[PDB]
Amino acid sequence: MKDILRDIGVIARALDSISNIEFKELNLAKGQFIYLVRICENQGIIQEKLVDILKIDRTTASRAIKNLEKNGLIIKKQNKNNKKNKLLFPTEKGQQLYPLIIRENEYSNAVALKGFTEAEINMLTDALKKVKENIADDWLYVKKGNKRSY
Amino acid sequence: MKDILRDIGVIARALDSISNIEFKELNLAKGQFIYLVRICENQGIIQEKLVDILKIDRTTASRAIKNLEKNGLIIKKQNKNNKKNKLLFPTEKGQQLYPLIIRENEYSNAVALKGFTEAEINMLTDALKKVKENIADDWLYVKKGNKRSY
DNA sequence: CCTATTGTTGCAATTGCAACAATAGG
DNA sequence: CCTATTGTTGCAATTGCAACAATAGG
């Protein structure tokens, strides 16, 4: 069985570090861009749903989202039928940053996917989607506190 | 073209968070285990070379390597020919941790590579190798300070 | 002498395990 | 009432852009 955890970890460290440095121009912090991007596509969704689809810690997302709302990029309004859910909507400062973030994310994507044909990227989109699903259960299994057996 | 950066970010966050909590029992910090894995297999390596292979910040490294030596997990040695380079070697408690660490990583890799035939993982190893190489230039590009033009 | 390497700290922010809250929804 | 959901703070870290120092190797 050949390792894959290493390269995927390397590739993510680079792409995230590039995005952090480039987005510091737009005053976005270390990991704050992954939230607003997802919040802009799915308007009004909840911390717990983002925590699930993004696979980050809940407390880490809580304070990181507190700044995006403090610094005026998103707004957390509540629903009349739910006293606990906080529906996270983007502001006009956030709606204008989304087309720019898509360009850095897409240009970094084109640099990373340089050399692949249209069929090769789909074979890689499917392979990564499968790996993302295979690891989803064990992430919450360890996140809850349960001990793995190996 | 389709997007690949998003899934790669999710997979690397989950695999890292799983490894962090499970290596917390072995008194390794938030991201310290990635260094010791490489130092054990590359004895006499320098901190700068690790920064290049792992694609993490140089300041993030140096501060983290300090704890690795401060907590007796590795050792910083000086050479005769070079008063600038610090050849990094693991301690004895560092060597005994290596077969355990590549046992959790090995199993996390098997969970991630679930349902792939032996050929499908090679088509994935070779694919991720290019993506790692394709992004190698642009990361040091931005890290050094030069602005990127789309 | 000169420039790229190799390596460290000053703030200042993020990160995340506990540990604790409070509603949802039976 | 009960339990899963959803959420925030306490606090001790790591993390990272500046701003530095110091030898390597011409």
Which nucleotide has the least CA–C1' distance to B59?
D16
Domain limits at A114?
Answer: 2-150
DSSP state of B82: -
CA angle B99, B102, B105 (to 5 degrees): 150
Flag if A124 and B34 touch (Cβ within 8 Å).
no
Length of chain A: 150
Cα–Cα distance for residue pair A50/A105, rounded to 1 Å: 19
**Whole-angstrom Cα Rg for chain A:** 17
Between the CA atoms of B97, B98, B100 and B102, what dihedral angle is there, to the nearest 10 degrees?
150
Q: Which residues of A touch B122 (CB under 8 A)?
A: 2
Instruction: Please give the resolution of this entry in Å, rounded to 1 decimal.
Output: 2.7
DSSP for B95-126 reads HHHHHHHHHHHHHHHHHHS-S--HHHHHHHHH
> What 3-state class would DSSP assign to B73?
coil
Å separating the CA of residue A22 from the C1' of nucleotide C22 = 40
According to DSSP, residue B16 is labeled: H
| Beta-strand relationship, B86-90 and B74-78 | antiparallel
The H or E element spanning position A143 is helix A136-144
For residue B68, give the nearest of B37, B99, B41 by alpha carbon.
B37
Place of tokens 């989304």: A98
Are B17 and A103 a contacting pair at CB < 8 A?
no
Residues in chain A after which the backbone breaks (C–N beyond 2.5 Å): none
| Tally of domains within chain B | 1
Method used to solve the structure: X-ray
Interface A:B, Cβ pairs < 8 A:
190
B113 φ, ψ to 5°? Answer: -95, 70
* Cα–Cα dist B94/A105, whole Å: 38
Output the CA–CA distances (angstroms, integers) from residue B97 to A132, B39, B106, in the order listed.
Answer: 28, 12, 14
Mutation site for A-interface testing, chosen from B13, B50, B114 by largest number of A Cβ within 10 Å: B13
Helix axes A5-23, B5-23, angle to 10 degrees: 110
Q: For nucleic chain C, give residues with Cβ below 7 angstroms from it.
A: A 29-32, 56-57, 59-60, 63-64, 67, 81-85, 143, 145; B 17, 20-21, 24, 30, 46-48, 58-59, 62-63, 65-66, 76, 84-86
The token pair at A25 is 């121009």
φ/ψ (deg, to 5) at A115: 100, -15
Location of structure tokens 């970890």: A9
Neighbours of A110 (CB within 10 A): 12
Identity of the residue numbered A88? L
- Which residues touch A16 (CB under 8 Å, ≥6 apart)? A31, B9
CA B96, chain centre distance (Å) = 18
Which single residue is written with the structure tokens 């040091």? B140
Contact residues for B121 (Cβ-Cβ < 8 A; gap 6+): A1, A2, A4, B113
Q: Residue A70 is encoded by which pair of tokens?
A: 């403090």
3-state secondary structure A11-38: HHHHHHHHHHHHHHHHCCCCCCHHHHHH
Question: How many of the other CB atoms lie within 10 Å of CB of B44?
Answer: 12
- Classify the C-alpha dihedral B33-B34-B37-B40 as positive or negative: negative
The CATH number of whichever domain residue A78 belongs to comes to 1.10.10.10
